[PDB]
């Protein structure tokens, strides 16, 4: 040893101790931050980030909604979109979806709940639907003004809804008919 | 005359349509719904595809309507069975039934689709240059020790 080898082994001990402690600490960091993130915080949360872009259709009801809404979040998003570069608006719905699939998660598409969960259930199964709906709309059966068909088709739609025909039909064409299937991966194995 | 628009999966083409004729040419949700609604209301129905393929709307200049709403108001069709969003501007010119499907605007994001490929976890936290360096320090004390 001769006291020089002792201090070499001691300073070396300090060195390797610092290094492995650093490894453990930084690995703890990389693990913690990995478990510290959630996929969907909120519809507003998507607006509160300036990296992940978000868009709607160029000519549609969604855009007009965002413009017309006086709610702070939606106005902020619209103010963003009309000045955003490049443009977050798309020509077709498929254009927007295709943009989502090629973004590596760097672009979000805002669309009808139905179309959303349908694309979610259609190949190549690359699109996930997150969060609750941002509004409340509905589809209905249109009849001519003061026609002889209005009341009966109304009552009909109602009865069909109550018997469960509508739910079963929707479930069939979304889940039974087309399938990404997998039974939602057993709820993604928890 | 039931007017509707080709939109998947509401009203679709079986692709064998060249062989068939009539309401057997179209398949989808709204087709089946039209069938049941007609079965409860008691009438024979003929499915017709709208000529422009765009839902209702109105121009400020012409003042006219286009799409399925156009075919209903100007009397080109008897009923519109399709995923038609109920708005105020339509309920003025047409009579809407109660909603048969409720929906809203939701957010779509690219699915995670991640299964961890990394063949070495240990070199992630520390930089590669740092490992090379610590090898140089190892040999650097090793030469002193020798």
């Amino acid at each position: 040893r001769s006291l020089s080898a002792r201090i070499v082994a001691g300073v070396w001990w300090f060195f390797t101790l610092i290094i492995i402690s650093s490894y453990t600490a930084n690995l703890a960091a990389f693990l913690t931050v990995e478990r510290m993130v959630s996929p969907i915080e909120s519809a507003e949360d998507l607006s509160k980030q300036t990296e992940i872009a978000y868009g709607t259709l160029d000519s549609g009801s969604t855009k007009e909604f965002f413009r017309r809404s006086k709610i702070a979040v939606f106005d902020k998003m619209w103010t963003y979109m009309r000045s955003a570069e490049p443009s977050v608006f798309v020509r077709t719905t498929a254009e927007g979806v295709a943009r989502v699939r090629k973004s590596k998660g760097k672009y979000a598409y805002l669309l009808e709940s139905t179309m959303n969960e349908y694309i979610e259930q259609r190949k190549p199964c690359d699109t996930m639907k997150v969060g609750g709906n941002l509004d409340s709309k509905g589809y209905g059966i249109a009849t001519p003004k003061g026609s002889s068909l209005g009341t009966p088709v109304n009552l009909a739609v109602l009865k069909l809804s109550e018997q469960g025909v509508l739910d079963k039909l929707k479930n069939k064409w979304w889940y039974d008919k087309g399938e990404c299937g997998a039974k939602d991966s057993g709820s993604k194995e928890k | 005359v039931v007017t509707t628009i080709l939109e998947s999966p509401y009203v679709m083409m079986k692709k064998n349509h060249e062989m068939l004729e009539g309401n057997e040419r179209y398949e989808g949700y709204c087709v089946d719904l039209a069938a049941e609604i007609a079965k409860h209301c008691g009438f024979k129905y003929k499915l017709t595809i709208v000529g422009d393929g765009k839902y209702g709307a109105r121009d400020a200049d012409t003042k006219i309507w286009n799409g399925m709403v156009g075919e209903l108001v100007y009397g080109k069709a008897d009923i519109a069975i399709a995923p038609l969003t109920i708005t105020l501007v339509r309920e003025e010119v047409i009579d809407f039934s109660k909603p048969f499907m409720s929906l809203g605007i939701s957010i779509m994001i690219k699915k995670p689709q991640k299964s961890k490929p990394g063949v070495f976890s240990f070199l992630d936290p520390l930089a590669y240059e740092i490992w090379m360096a610590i090898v140089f320090a190892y040999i650097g004390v090793s030469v002193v020790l020798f």
Binding site: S4, I7, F14, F15, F30 | A127, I130
Partner: peptide, 28 residues
């Protein structure tokens, strides 16, 4: 994601060779 640590660890890395210099200083 971070998890790239470089300069600081390079410093604490750097003090060791100084310790080797001190070792040679004491050896002679």
């Amino acid at each position: 994601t971070s998890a790239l640590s470089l300069s600081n660890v390079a410093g604490v890395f750097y003090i060791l060779v100084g310790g080797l210099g001190l070792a040679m200083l004491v050896a002679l």
